[PDB]
Every structure is written in C-alpha cells, then in structure tokens.
Amino acid sequence: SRVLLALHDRAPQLKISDDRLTVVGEKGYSMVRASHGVRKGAWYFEITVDEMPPDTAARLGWSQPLGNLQAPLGYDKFSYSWRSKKGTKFHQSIGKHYSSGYGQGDVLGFYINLPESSEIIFYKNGVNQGVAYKDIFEGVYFPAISLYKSCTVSINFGPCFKYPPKDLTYRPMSDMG
Amino acid sequence: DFKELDENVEYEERESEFDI
Amino acid sequence: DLPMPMRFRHLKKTSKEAVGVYRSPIHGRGLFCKRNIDAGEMVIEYAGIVIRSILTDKREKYYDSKGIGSSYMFRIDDSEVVDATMHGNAARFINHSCEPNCYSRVINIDGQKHIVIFAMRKIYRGEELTYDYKFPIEDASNKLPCNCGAKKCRKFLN
Amino acid sequence: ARTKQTAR
Ligand SMILES: Nc1ncnc2c1ncn2[C@@H]1O[C@H](CSCC[C@H](N)C(=O)O)[C@@H](O)[C@H]1O
Numbered sequence: 562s563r564v565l566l567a568l569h570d571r572a573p574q575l576k577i578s579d580d581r582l583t584v585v586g587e588k589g590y591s592m593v594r595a596s597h598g599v600r601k602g603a604w605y606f607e608i609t610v611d612e613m614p615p616d617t618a619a620r621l622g623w624s625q626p627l628g629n630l631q632a633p634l635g636y637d638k639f640s641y642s643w644r645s646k647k648g649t650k651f652h653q654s655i656g657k658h659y660s661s662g663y664g665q666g667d668v669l670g671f672y673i674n675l676p677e678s679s680e681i682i683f684y685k686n687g688v689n690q691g692v693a694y695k696d697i698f699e700g701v702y703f704p705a706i707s708l709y710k711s712c713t714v715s716i717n718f719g720p721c722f723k724y725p726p727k728d729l730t731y732r733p734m735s736d737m738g
Numbered sequence: 739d740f741k742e743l744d745e746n747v748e749y750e751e752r753e754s755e756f757d758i
Numbered sequence: 759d760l761p762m763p764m765r766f767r768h769l770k771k772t773s774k775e776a777v778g779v780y781r782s783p784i785h786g787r788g789l790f791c792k793r794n795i796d797a798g799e800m801v802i803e804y805a806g807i808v809i810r811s812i813l814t815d816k817r818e819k820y821y822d823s824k825g826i827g828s829s830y831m832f833r834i835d836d837s838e839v840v841d842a843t844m845h846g847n848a849a850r851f852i853n854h855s856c857e858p859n860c861y862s863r864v865i866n867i868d869g870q871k872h873i874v875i876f877a878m879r880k881i882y883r884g885e886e887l888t889y890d891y892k893f894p895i896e897d898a899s900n901k902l903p904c905n906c907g908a909k910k911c912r913k914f915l916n
Numbered sequence: 917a918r919t920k921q922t923a924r
C-alpha cells in the first residue's frame with residue numbers, strides 16, 4: 562500500500578510533490594498528516610529539512626486525527642510539536658524549552674512509544690534531544706508536518722533511516738503500509 | 739456525546755482484549 | 759443496476775445534505791428529511807466501530823459503569839455489530855416506528871459489511887426518518903413503550 | 917443484549 566503524506570487529510574494550500582513525500586509550506590502555519598497512524602507500540606520516522614529560507618519555520622511531530630490542519634502542529638490537545646526556531650516544544654499552543662533549533666539539511670527523528678509510560682522523543686541527526694512528552698493522550702497518532710511559509714521538508718517513514726538512533730527499539734512507520 | 743465519524747472503523751483488538 | 763460501491767459512496771457524498779437532526783414528536787431528537795428521497799434510495803449509513811459480536815457484552819456492561827443510558831449497538835449478523843455509542847454519525851438519532859418509511863439492510867463493500875438505511879417508499883422533505891428497530895421481545899420488565907403515533911402501533915419497542 | 921437487528 563505504502564505510507565505517504567495523506568491525499569485528502571491535508572491543508573489544501575500545502576505544496577505536496579507527486580511522490581507525496583516532499584511538502585513545501587505556504588503562508589501561515591498549515592498541517593499535513595501521513596496516511597497511517599499508530600495506536601500501540603514504538604514507531605519512528607525521519608524528516609529532512611531540504612530548504613529553510615529566511616523567515617520560514619516548521620513544527621514537526623505527531624497528531625491525532627482531529628488536530629487543526631489550518632493551525633500549527635501542537636496548537637491543540639491533539640498534537641505535540643518540535644519547532645525549528647529555538648527547538649521549542651509545543652502542545653496546546655504552549656511552547657516550552659526543549660532543545661536547540663534545527664535548520665536546513667538537519668534530519669529530525671520522531672519516536673513515539675504507545676504501550677498496551679507513553680513517550681515522545683525527538684532526534685537531531687540521530688542524537689536524542691530528550692523526552693519531550695510523557696503520559697500523552699490516548700488515540701491514533703500520525704506523523705504530521707506544519708510549515709510556516711515556503712520551506713521544504715521531506716518525510717521518510719522507512720524502512721531505512723539515515724541516522725538510526727543508538728540503542729533504541731522501534732518499528733519503522735513504513736511497517737503500517 | 740459521541741465523536742462524529744464519517745466512515746466505519748474496524749476495531750483492532752489488542753492481544754490482551756479478553757484478559758482480566 | 760448501479761454497482762453497490764458507486765451507490766454506497768454516493769450516499770457518503772450526499773447524505774449530510776439530505777438529512778438533519780431536529781426535535782421529534784416521537785421522542786427527543788430525530789433525523790429528518792431535508793430533500794425529497796425516492797423509493798429504494800440510500801438514506802444514511804449507521805456508522806460506528808465494527809466489533810466482533812463476542813465483545814458487545816463486555817462493551818455493554820462498561821457503558822453502564824459510565825452511565826451512558828441507551829444502547830447504540832446495531833447487529834450486522836452472527837459475527838459483527840456496529841458499536842456507535844462513542845463514535846458514530848447522525849444515524850444514532852433515527853427513532854423507531856411501527857409503520858416506518860425506511861428499513862435497515864446490510865451491504866458488502868470490499869469484504870466489509872455496512873448497515874445502510876434505505877427508503878421504503880418515496881419520502882418528502884419535512885418527514886421524520888424512521889425504521890423498525892426490530893428489538894428482541896423482552897420481559898414485562900425492561901419493556902419500554904412506543905410513541906411513534908402510527909395508527910397500527912405495537913405500543914412497545916420490545 | 918439490546919442491539920437493533922436487520923431482521924428478527
Ligand atoms: N418510537 C419510539 N417511541 C418512543 N421512544 C422511542 C421510539 N423510538 C426510539 N425511542 C427512544 O429513543 C432512543 C433511540 S436512540 C435515538 C436518539 C434519541 N431519540 C435522541 O433524541 O437522542 C431509545 O432509547 C428509545 O428509548
């Protein structure tokens with residue numbers, strides 16, 4: 562089947578390439594989710610910032626199906642995001658200190674563990690940035706991208722990741738396809 | 739009072755679905 | 759005739775526009791006809807979580823413990839039941855009638871069964887959409903009455 | 917128990 566960026570479950574102004582793995586931002590923060598979400602286990606996917614011109618930003622992470630598409634990821638209770646500028650973490654529109662910022666060429670890793678103890682861990686070029694969210698809301702989580710203005714990112718669900726985290730057990734998001 | 743739904747969803751039972 | 763998947767998702771693409779949830783003379787709040795619906799046409803799907811029928815009894819006692827009153831489970835067959843108690847659509851609000859204008863019926867779409875309400879006759883805008891619940895007949899206790907107003911009303915939903 | 921049926 563394959564795990565791709567969602568065909569309809571997307572903000573209509575986002576530039577999504579025909580392969581449905583590269584997305585270009587347009588104006589105000591708008592979301593796109595992946596075609597598959599997860600409800601249990603440990604899963605992983607990578608996002609590569611292909612191009613981040615001046616005054617452009619990305620908030621990347623996991624979203625439940627009800628998260629607002631016309632808002633940034635992490636705007637409501639359905640998404641937790643990692644912001645490119647200052648490495649801020651956002652859930653319910655509250656930004657807290659998390660890590661250093663990520664820019665153009667950086668490869669970001671998104672880890673989620675949903676046991677049958679829940680955690681979200683962000684990665685910068687394979688290095689653990691720390692637990693960002695613990696004991697999260699129960700539901701299906703889909704890999705999600707929110708972009709502010711014309712920046713380009715490319716999503717990689719697996720099976721091969723460029724920077725596999727050291728000593729971390731997970732399944733690639735491509736296993737859902 | 740419910741969550742709105744458009745399409746049917748197949749319940750994916752967990753391994754311990756019938757466990758005490 | 760037109761293939762079921764074409765008929766089926768034409769429903770999903772026109773259903774929200776043909777029906778609405780209003781206040782009912784039968785009971786509480788009902789599903790009402792907003793545009794004339796021809797006989798035999800698909801009115802709405804009874805959407806929800808499709809579970810194995812063995813789970814309904816684990817499900818039903820759990821809903822009591824949280825206090826949810828009415829049952830919202832509809833049975834497809836011997837193996838499956840649509841649980842619309844927590845996740846569903848406007849088909850939850852369809853009241854029962856002893857002389858109804860719609861009927862429930864199971865259709866198969868790509869190896870998955872759905873419960874779709876069809877128009878028994880021609881239904882005009884303004885009407886309340888009702889079907890025969892067809893509950894198993896219960897005891898004198900746990901026997902709740904019917905107020906559909908039909909001139910041949912059985913007087914009980916059970 | 918109390919589920920609707922498509923026939924009795
Ligand atoms: N013909 C009828 N007469 C009286 N009550 C009815 C009825 N058909 C259905 N009901 C009641 O409506 C419920 C069906 S769920 C339908 C939604 C409900 N009418 C509402 O306003 O929210 C059942 O619990 C039953 O008690």
Ligand SMILES: [Zn+2]
Pocket residue numbers: 855856857904905906907908910911912913914
């Ligand atoms: Zn009656």
